[PDB]
């Protein structure tokens, strides 16, 4: 039940090297319902961006929402998500999979790009975790 904007934000310091995520689950009437920022281990920015999305996607389904629209900085996610682009890379193909077994779980979902300064608060979420690593 319900609809959520779920923000979404990887952070990391190599290819690979130390990697952060943050999420945001907001309502419609604005107020945050939930946030998280964790560190990952080690991972590419791609890789970050996208347990960003599926840590996103986790919460939201927790708390039984119906309708998701997630937002986010990331063209790599959002065109992959999509189905734009396909990749050859096994691992991200299998947080693609990852991230449709999830949304399949909400009777609808959309994404959008939002410029990073729009996504502050998952990049704080992130950065501010990756910053104590
Ligand atoms: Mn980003
Ligand atoms: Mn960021």
Same mark, same amino acid.
């Given at each position: 039940?319900? /609809?959520?904007?779920?923000?979404?934000?990887?952070?990391?310091?190599?290819?690979?090297?130390?990697?952060?995520?943050?999420?945001?689950?907001?309502?419609?009437?604005?107020?945050?319902?939930?946030?998280?920022?964790?560190?990952?281990?080690?991972?590419?920015?791609?890789?970050?961006?996208?347990?960003?999305?599926?840590?996103?996607?986790?919460?939201?389904?927790?708390?039984?929402?119906?309708?998701?629209?997630?937002?986010?900085?990331?063209?790599?996610?959002?065109?992959?998500?999509?189905?734009?682009?396909?990749?050859?890379?096994?691992?991200?193909? /299998?947080?693609?999979?990852?991230? /449709?077994?999830?949304?399949?779980?909400?009777? *609808?979902?959309?994404?959008?790009?939002?410029?990073?300064?729009?996504?502050? /608060?998952? *990049?704080?979420?992130?950065?501010?975790?990756?910053? *104590?690593?």
């Amino acid at each position: 039940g319900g /609809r959520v904007h779920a923000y979404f934000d990887g952070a990391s310091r190599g290819n690979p090297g130390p990697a952060a995520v943050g999420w945001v689950l907001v309502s419609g009437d604005g107020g945050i319902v939930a946030e998280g920022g964790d560190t990952i281990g080690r991972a590419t920015n791609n890789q970050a961006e996208y347990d960003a999305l599926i840590a996103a996607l986790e919460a939201a389904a927790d708390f039984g929402f119906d309708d998701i629209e997630l937002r986010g900085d990331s063209q790599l996610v959002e065109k992959q998500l999509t189905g734009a682009w396909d990749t050859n890379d096994p691992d991200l193909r /299998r947080k693609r999979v990852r991230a /449709r077994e999830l949304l399949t779980g909400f009777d *609808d979902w959309s994404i959008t790009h939002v410029p990073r300064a729009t996504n502050e /608060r998952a *990049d704080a979420l992130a950065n501010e975790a990756l910053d *104590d690593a």
